[model samples]
Target chain A: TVLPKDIPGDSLKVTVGTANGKPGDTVTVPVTFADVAKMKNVGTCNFYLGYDASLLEVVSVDAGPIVKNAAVNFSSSASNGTISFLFLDNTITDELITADGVFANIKFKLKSVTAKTTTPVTFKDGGAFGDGTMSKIASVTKTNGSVTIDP
Target chain B: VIVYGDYNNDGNVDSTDFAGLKKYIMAADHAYVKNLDVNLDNEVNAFDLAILKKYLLGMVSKLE
Candidate 1:
């Protein structure tokens, strides 16, 4: 606690972690939120995740541990190359997320790969907001993820 | 006047409190509880849970 640690990139960071798999296999990539403590009064959040459509086929998306059917319910849609995520708190009381955890898990099936390779999963563009005023309390700093598939 | 993570007011932070908070979030029944928002974010979410876990691990000295 006493030791100082530098938070990577921006304080409000949406980062994706790495995954590995072989052809005809499925891999799960975790999308994480970092330093959400700085974001105040946030009641709504959404983001667009982009990946190489040729390398991986999207399967499913699920809310992480924090928002698993509680605190808030989220909506997600996935296509060949892009995925969108949205979360809203409609409680009688306004509750906003303010933690650093894997907010979403994305599952993808590996495409046929003759050789080992890697591809980048990046964020396209999106925004988050506070409850009452619905104004921008924070802007996201998105970090890309990578998938390494083997033959 | 509040001890964070001491959900039962037992004056100690332990797994008991952690279990309680997990239930509180799972049920989404925080409509009446107060001081559970250890992060002071007005809304009790995973951040509060994170802080509570860190606080117990000595990574955090106190609950803000």
Candidate 2:
């Protein structure tokens, strides 16, 4: 019989509004691409934003094998009441690749603000090329009005 | 150039769509019938199906 092994780490973490943001209020979304030392011959990668079960609305996307010392930054105009981050790692490796990072300081414009403090938002990965069957990388909900995207 | 949604600007895909495509075939000049050019590639053929699929699926949003 074969033995199963434990997976090493978490996937991604997300955090939102430090202070409760009301609708019509603009907030900043900061995303940090994972740091993978094992990646080799990394290829172009694409990412996007989408609301629950609806067609994805892409804000910004970038592709590269170019290595940078810091995480790539992306921003979007405040629109949807809820938001999340999606990422694709097109890195080429015969072995499995794991990514970990955060979508930080993403601000959502609250429409018809409610008394409830925390709202659950879902972010799914793999909408590039418009194929829906792609893998869903990760999803996270707000904690204390903030959500973590990891795991 | 005719967009992907309509082959004859008829706003629907039907026999007219195929007729528009047939016109281009008889003309042997695909550029003559804009409606038949589903991909806006200046010519129409089997390759246009890929573009038509996008239109039918509502994946390609019209400009506001």
Candidate 3:
């Protein structure tokens, strides 16, 4: 999801739930992409988001481990496009140990960029258990960024 | 004339437990919290012999 740049620790919002009416059966997350720089000829990029799920309830928001991965490849034709994913990640066994709860940290890497213009990057993921959701608490991005390969 | 069976019940009082107990005594409320009052007196007074002697002896052994 594209996110606003230079935002405070608060301003970010995200949720996970079944959009197909399969609530409480399985967790489905929704992500929004924003603030991405209009670019062209972008190859592919990786996304990661982390979160805690204990003190956070799992109603319309799962309090379980959520882990997911997907690949997006843009051709040389499309310009100024956005990307969104339904499943980001899952809750884990170790994450439930709240005495030492975990924090979500995200990072992205450009596999390759064949374009000469700038590209903006943003990521969003939800922490779910069983039909529960936690609002997006943190976000990071690299704007007008480029990738290079050195021998 | 001391009753010994693991004063701290951590298998053995040893020097470590003794030092810990001494520190507990110096601190208010901590002495009772550590439960080093072997004689079970309301207060950890000088009459609490067995545990005190054990701590003293443990200190001396390390000195040598």
**Candidate-wise lDDT, in order:** 0.67, 0.34, 0.27
Looking at model 3, residue A35 earns an lDDT score of: 22
Q: What tens digits encode model 1's per-residue C-alpha lDDT throughout A69-110?
A: 543346677765778776655341244565669889999899
Query: Which is the leading candidate under TM-score?
Result: 1
Please give, for residues B1-64, the per-residue lDDT of candidate 1 as tens digits.
Answer: 6676787789887878966664454332245356677756566554555556556667668876
Estimate, for each residue in A20-98, the C-alpha lDDT of model 3 and write its tens digit. Answer: 2111232233333222122211111222222222111123321222222211111011112222212211121111112
DockQ-superior candidate, 1 or 2: 2
Find the 10 residues in a row with the least total lDDT in model 3 chain A.
A70-79
What DockQ does each listed candidate score? 0.02, 0.03, 0.01
**What TM-score, computed on C-alpha atoms, does each candidate reach?**
0.59, 0.31, 0.20
| Location of the lowest summed lDDT over 10 successive residues in candidate 1 chain A | A126-135
Docking class of 1: incorrect
lDDT of 2 by residue, A1-151 (tens): 4433333243323322333445444444344444332222112222333332121222442322222221421112223423322221211122122343443334434444334344444443322111111222333222233322211
